[PDB]
Coordinates of C-alpha atoms in Angstrom, one line a residue:
Chain A
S1 CA 30.1 -1.1 21.2
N2 CA 29.7 1.6 18.6
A3 CA 32.1 -0.4 16.4
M4 CA 29.4 -2.2 14.4
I5 CA 27.6 1.0 13.5
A6 CA 31.0 2.6 12.7
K7 CA 31.6 -0.2 10.2
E8 CA 28.1 0.2 8.7
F9 CA 28.6 4.0 8.5
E10 CA 32.0 3.6 6.8
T11 CA 30.7 1.2 4.2
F12 CA 27.8 3.5 3.3
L13 CA 30.3 6.4 2.9
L14 CA 32.3 4.4 0.3
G15 CA 29.1 4.2 -1.7
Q16 CA 29.2 8.0 -2.2
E17 CA 33.0 8.3 -2.2
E18 CA 33.1 9.5 -5.8
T19 CA 30.4 12.1 -5.4
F20 CA 32.4 13.8 -2.6
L21 CA 34.6 15.6 -5.0
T22 CA 33.7 19.1 -6.1
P23 CA 35.8 19.5 -9.2
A24 CA 37.9 22.6 -9.9
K25 CA 36.2 22.9 -13.3
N26 CA 33.1 24.5 -11.8
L27 CA 34.7 26.0 -8.7
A28 CA 35.6 29.7 -8.0
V29 CA 39.2 30.2 -6.9
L30 CA 41.7 33.1 -6.6
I31 CA 45.2 33.9 -7.7
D32 CA 48.0 34.3 -5.2
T33 CA 49.4 37.5 -6.8
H34 CA 46.2 39.6 -7.2
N35 CA 45.9 42.5 -4.8
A36 CA 44.1 42.1 -1.5
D37 CA 41.6 45.0 -1.9
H38 CA 40.4 43.4 -5.1
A39 CA 39.9 40.0 -3.4
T40 CA 37.8 41.7 -0.7
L41 CA 35.5 43.0 -3.4
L42 CA 35.2 39.5 -4.9
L43 CA 34.7 37.6 -1.6
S44 CA 32.1 40.2 -0.6
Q45 CA 29.8 38.9 -3.4
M46 CA 30.7 35.2 -3.7
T47 CA 28.5 32.5 -2.2
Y48 CA 31.1 30.6 -0.2
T49 CA 33.1 32.1 2.7
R50 CA 36.4 30.5 1.8
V51 CA 38.0 29.8 -1.7
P52 CA 41.0 28.0 -2.9
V53 CA 44.1 30.0 -3.9
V54 CA 45.9 28.9 -7.1
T55 CA 48.4 30.4 -9.5
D56 CA 48.9 30.8 -13.3
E57 CA 50.8 27.6 -13.1
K58 CA 47.9 26.2 -11.1
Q59 CA 50.0 25.3 -8.0
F60 CA 47.8 25.1 -4.9
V61 CA 48.9 27.8 -2.5
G62 CA 46.2 27.5 0.2
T63 CA 42.8 28.9 1.2
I64 CA 41.7 32.4 2.1
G65 CA 38.5 34.1 3.2
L66 CA 37.3 37.5 4.4
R67 CA 38.4 36.5 7.9
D68 CA 42.0 36.1 6.8
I69 CA 41.9 39.3 4.7
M70 CA 40.2 41.5 7.3
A71 CA 42.4 40.1 10.1
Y72 CA 45.5 41.2 8.1
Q73 CA 44.0 44.6 7.4
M74 CA 42.9 45.1 11.0
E75 CA 45.8 43.6 13.0
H76 CA 48.2 45.7 10.9
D77 CA 45.8 48.7 10.6
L78 CA 46.4 49.2 6.8
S79 CA 44.5 51.6 4.5
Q80 CA 42.7 50.7 1.3
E81 CA 45.6 52.1 -0.8
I82 CA 48.1 49.7 0.9
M83 CA 45.6 46.8 0.4
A84 CA 45.5 47.4 -3.4
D85 CA 49.3 47.1 -3.3
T86 CA 49.5 44.0 -1.1
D87 CA 49.6 40.5 -2.6
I88 CA 47.0 37.9 -1.4
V89 CA 49.7 35.4 -0.6
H90 CA 50.8 37.4 2.5
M91 CA 47.6 36.4 4.2
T92 CA 46.7 33.2 2.4
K93 CA 46.3 30.4 4.9
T94 CA 48.9 27.9 3.5
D95 CA 49.2 25.8 6.7
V96 CA 46.1 23.8 5.8
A97 CA 45.5 20.1 5.1
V98 CA 45.2 18.4 1.7
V99 CA 44.6 14.9 0.3
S100 CA 45.6 13.1 -2.9
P101 CA 43.1 12.3 -5.6
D102 CA 43.1 8.7 -4.2
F103 CA 41.7 9.9 -0.9
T104 CA 40.4 7.6 1.8
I105 CA 37.3 8.3 3.9
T106 CA 39.3 8.3 7.2
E107 CA 41.4 11.2 6.0
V108 CA 38.4 13.1 4.8
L109 CA 36.3 13.0 8.0
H110 CA 39.4 13.6 10.1
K111 CA 40.7 16.6 8.2
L112 CA 37.2 18.1 7.7
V113 CA 37.1 18.8 11.5
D114 CA 39.5 21.7 11.2
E115 CA 38.7 23.2 7.8
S116 CA 35.3 23.7 6.1
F117 CA 36.4 22.1 2.9
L118 CA 39.2 19.7 1.9
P119 CA 41.4 20.7 -1.1
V120 CA 42.1 18.0 -3.6
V121 CA 45.4 18.4 -5.4
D122 CA 47.4 16.0 -7.6
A123 CA 50.7 14.2 -7.0
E124 CA 52.3 17.0 -9.0
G125 CA 50.7 20.0 -7.3
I126 CA 47.8 20.9 -9.6
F127 CA 44.6 21.9 -7.7
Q128 CA 41.8 19.7 -9.0
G129 CA 38.9 20.1 -6.6
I130 CA 37.6 20.2 -3.1
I131 CA 35.6 18.0 -0.7
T132 CA 33.2 20.1 1.3
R133 CA 31.7 19.5 4.7
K134 CA 28.3 20.0 3.0
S135 CA 29.0 16.9 0.8
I136 CA 29.8 14.7 3.7
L137 CA 26.7 15.9 5.6
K138 CA 24.5 15.1 2.6
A139 CA 25.7 11.5 2.9
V140 CA 25.1 11.5 6.7
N141 CA 21.6 12.8 6.0
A142 CA 21.0 10.2 3.4
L143 CA 21.7 7.4 5.9
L144 CA 18.7 8.4 8.1
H145 CA 16.3 8.0 5.1
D146 CA 16.9 4.4 3.8
Chain B
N1 CA 18.2 -2.4 6.6
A2 CA 16.1 0.5 7.9
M3 CA 17.2 -0.6 11.4
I4 CA 20.6 1.0 10.7
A5 CA 19.1 4.5 10.6
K6 CA 17.8 3.8 14.1
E7 CA 21.3 2.6 15.2
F8 CA 23.0 5.7 13.7
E9 CA 20.4 8.1 15.2
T10 CA 20.7 6.5 18.6
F11 CA 24.5 7.1 18.4
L12 CA 24.1 10.8 17.4
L13 CA 21.5 11.2 20.2
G14 CA 24.3 10.2 22.5
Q15 CA 26.4 13.1 21.2
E16 CA 24.2 16.0 22.3
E17 CA 27.0 17.5 24.4
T18 CA 29.2 17.7 21.3
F19 CA 27.2 19.2 18.4
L20 CA 25.0 21.3 20.6
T21 CA 27.0 24.2 22.1
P22 CA 25.2 26.3 24.7
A23 CA 25.0 30.1 24.4
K24 CA 27.0 30.2 27.7
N25 CA 30.1 29.0 25.8
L26 CA 29.6 31.3 22.8
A27 CA 30.7 34.8 21.8
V28 CA 27.6 36.7 20.7
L29 CA 27.1 40.3 19.6
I30 CA 24.5 42.9 20.5
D31 CA 22.5 44.2 17.6
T32 CA 23.6 47.8 18.6
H33 CA 27.3 47.1 18.2
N34 CA 28.7 49.4 15.5
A35 CA 29.6 47.7 12.3
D36 CA 33.2 49.1 12.3
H37 CA 34.4 47.5 15.5
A38 CA 32.4 44.3 14.7
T39 CA 34.6 43.9 11.7
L40 CA 37.7 44.0 14.0
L41 CA 35.8 41.7 16.4
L42 CA 34.9 39.2 13.7
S43 CA 38.3 39.1 12.1
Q44 CA 39.8 38.0 15.4
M45 CA 37.3 35.2 16.1
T46 CA 37.6 31.7 14.7
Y47 CA 33.9 31.3 13.7
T48 CA 32.7 32.5 10.4
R49 CA 29.2 33.4 11.7
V50 CA 28.2 34.6 15.2
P51 CA 24.7 35.0 16.5
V52 CA 23.2 38.4 17.2
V53 CA 21.0 39.1 20.2
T54 CA 19.4 42.1 21.9
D55 CA 20.2 43.4 25.4
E56 CA 17.6 40.9 26.6
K57 CA 19.2 38.0 24.7
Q58 CA 16.4 38.0 22.1
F59 CA 17.8 36.2 19.1
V60 CA 18.0 38.6 16.1
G61 CA 20.1 36.5 13.6
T62 CA 23.6 35.6 12.5
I63 CA 26.2 37.9 11.1
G64 CA 29.5 37.4 9.2
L65 CA 32.1 39.5 7.6
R66 CA 30.5 39.0 4.2
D67 CA 27.3 40.6 5.6
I68 CA 29.2 43.6 6.8
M69 CA 31.4 43.8 3.7
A70 CA 28.5 43.5 1.2
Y71 CA 26.5 46.0 3.1
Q72 CA 29.3 48.6 2.8
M73 CA 29.6 47.9 -0.9
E74 CA 25.9 48.0 -1.6
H75 CA 25.5 51.3 0.3
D76 CA 28.8 53.1 -0.5
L77 CA 29.2 53.8 3.2
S78 CA 32.4 55.4 4.5
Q79 CA 34.3 54.3 7.6
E80 CA 32.9 57.0 9.9
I81 CA 29.3 56.2 8.9
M82 CA 29.8 52.6 10.3
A83 CA 31.1 53.9 13.6
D84 CA 27.4 54.9 14.0
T85 CA 25.7 52.0 12.1
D86 CA 24.3 49.2 14.1
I87 CA 25.0 45.6 12.9
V88 CA 21.2 44.8 13.0
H89 CA 20.9 46.7 9.7
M90 CA 23.0 44.0 8.1
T91 CA 22.3 41.0 10.4
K92 CA 20.9 38.0 8.5
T93 CA 17.4 37.6 10.0
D94 CA 16.3 35.2 7.2
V95 CA 17.9 32.1 8.8
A96 CA 16.4 28.7 9.8
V97 CA 16.5 27.9 13.5
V98 CA 15.3 25.1 15.8
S99 CA 13.6 24.8 19.1
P100 CA 15.3 22.9 22.0
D101 CA 12.8 20.1 21.1
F102 CA 14.7 19.3 17.9
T103 CA 15.0 15.9 16.2
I104 CA 18.2 14.6 14.7
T105 CA 16.5 14.0 11.4
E106 CA 15.5 17.7 11.1
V107 CA 18.9 19.0 12.4
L108 CA 20.7 17.3 9.5
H109 CA 17.8 18.5 7.3
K110 CA 18.5 22.1 8.3
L111 CA 22.3 21.7 8.1
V112 CA 22.2 20.8 4.4
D113 CA 20.8 24.2 3.4
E114 CA 23.1 26.1 5.9
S115 CA 26.1 25.4 8.1
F116 CA 24.9 27.3 11.1
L117 CA 21.8 26.3 13.1
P118 CA 20.9 28.4 16.2
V119 CA 18.6 27.1 19.0
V120 CA 15.9 29.5 19.9
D121 CA 13.1 28.6 22.4
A122 CA 9.4 29.4 21.9
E123 CA 9.9 32.8 23.7
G124 CA 12.7 34.0 21.5
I125 CA 15.8 33.7 23.7
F126 CA 19.0 32.4 22.1
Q127 CA 20.2 29.2 23.7
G128 CA 22.8 27.6 21.5
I129 CA 24.0 26.6 18.0
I130 CA 24.7 23.4 16.0
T131 CA 27.2 23.6 13.2
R132 CA 28.3 21.2 10.5
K133 CA 31.8 21.3 12.1
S134 CA 30.2 20.3 15.4
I135 CA 28.3 17.4 13.9
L136 CA 31.4 16.1 12.2
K137 CA 33.0 16.1 15.6
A138 CA 30.2 13.8 16.8
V139 CA 30.6 11.3 13.9
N140 CA 34.4 11.5 14.4
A141 CA 33.7 9.5 17.6
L142 CA 33.3 6.6 15.2
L143 CA 36.6 7.3 13.4
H144 CA 38.8 5.2 15.8
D145 CA 36.7 2.2 14.8
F146 CA 37.4 2.9 11.1
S147 CA 39.5 0.4 9.2
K148 CA 41.8 0.9 6.2
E149 CA 40.5 1.2 2.7
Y150 CA 42.0 -2.0 1.3
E151 CA 40.5 -3.9 4.3
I152 CA 36.9 -3.9 2.8
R153 CA 35.9 -5.1 -0.6

């Protein structure tokens, strides 16, 4: 049937529903108005391959990675001097998904198919954290040892 | 009940053709590809990491743009120097892989330390990969049988 195991798998996920959030407090992000050459230097040393993009007013703009930056620099064949004069927002992936702080497990697992982590903003627009694929896979791995 | 872990593993065992993508359906890179064009090549692909093989499909490792970018920074290399630099010099060879005789419990075990799990046979030939994205596709087969939040208490 696969509907009984789907119900048992869902109930177990609600047990770790609160431990899914990676808060913005300890979470490296970027500013949408810093230059692109500088963000290439920062992303070339950070641990994660994609980071959230916020502002001074902390409005969530989107996500960005070296893939998005290098694609902009390669597709348009732009030198390093032009990159130091180009804002990050012109290559920030803004057409991404997002969930409210009162997120449901069905939205999480569904939207986590397309992006590697799920941004958690507020009802106003303030970026507050992310839900990573790694966090969900930790719960899936904890189900096999019980 | 510990019987549930058997039920869930039985389901995932029925998803082999989803989380396991064969090398035949993957874009790989030869270790002798120059690091300059590989940056163009990687920027156009949708995957963050791609496996690296020899001319005889011997699995070398995985590579991403961070590996190329951090290598240029660490070594102060110019653009022309990387038209002659092979990507093997920056390919991540310190990765965990699995044989085709993998268990579900150890695939998830390996996919908690990394997000990219290659499949290499005992000889050394690259056969396929398993990603966190691909496993989430497998468990998303249960998503249609998911109910609303306020329907469980």
